[PDB]
Amino acid sequence: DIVMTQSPSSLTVTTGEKVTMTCKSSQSLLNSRTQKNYLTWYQQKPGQSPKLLIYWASTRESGVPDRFTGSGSGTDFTLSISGVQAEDLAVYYCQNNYNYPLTFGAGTKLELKRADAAPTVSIFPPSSEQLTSGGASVVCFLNNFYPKDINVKWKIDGSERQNGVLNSWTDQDSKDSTYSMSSTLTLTKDEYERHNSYTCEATHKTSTSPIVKSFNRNE
């Protein structure tokens, strides 16, 4: 088996910058015959299927932009993006097309760096269809922050609750490099009605004092 090895594993660049990644073959991919180096590069964006970028070490397929460029021959190959863009955030794979099995290198994750920005917070009381079902979920969305570290606290009439809280982040936005997070707390239809003031509190470098959003069960 040829053993494809990629590096670095991840790379923090700035929109605008110009990156270079490596893919080293453990045996030669160069065809004497044809004088083609059988190396391909795929790009996989979050939640999407891989997309081909370049066959034979440098031909670029139909539609692939030319900020992408693949040089190299033999056992050392590199890919470069120049003036990387928000939409270039993804995992880049390199694969062997020389001999079987056609093995894939392990990835190069391309994360983006950017201006700090504060969450936007919103909160939603449980909903009639759910209460009926006799369950209650309070959701709070914190969207478009950067950096990704944020702390959300839920308070019921002023006390903090940790049990029944699911948090979750989106990946950097492909359009603004930002993150989004959603916190949802599940109570019984009872626990729900026992109280009236629910508060979602987020803490983030962006502010000095917590962003707080609240609601009153009756209203």
Add this chain to the structure above:
Amino acid sequence: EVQLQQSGAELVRPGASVKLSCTTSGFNIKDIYIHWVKQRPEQGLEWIGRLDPANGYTKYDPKFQGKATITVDTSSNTAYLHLSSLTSEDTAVYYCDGYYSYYDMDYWGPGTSVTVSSAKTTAPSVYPLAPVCSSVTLGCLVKGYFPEPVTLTWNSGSLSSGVHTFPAVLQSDLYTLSSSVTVTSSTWPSQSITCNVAHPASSTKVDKKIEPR
């Protein structure tokens, strides 16, 4: 638009086996060499095997030879992956792909998510999230479903700007997901907002309109 289409998430009990399928759309299978690729959760890509629809010869990773089998039905322009004696390690999204000269383009299918487990499939409850009594943001909650994935979109594809979907989380061995959408405030509730959710593995679909509260 030439495209490759695939089958539709499934849950299979350990020890059983599944037949995933991959059809061409607006071109013909004999015109390409079809590959199959596995991708495990958070893992990287693994080539499984490749097929030649002209002769029917298939070639694999020695690694998958005893579990994998590619077959083709050149008459219905469909290739197939029959995985057998399934395990936990067989839980992944499986893609099918092929280079097509004429378009100078490698078409990839959308993947077919296979979950190996003895749990039961349970369809989601979806709930519309209206705001509390310029821009106003809404959301949908998809709750208590298994196995993944679910497809959630708004105004069935229209409204796609400033939409955010959150990766699903487990808890009870059921998943929960939510998505929010921020729009300009004239829009709602002038122009109606609808959250469309589909859970392939249980073949259920749901439309929920977000009305004001």
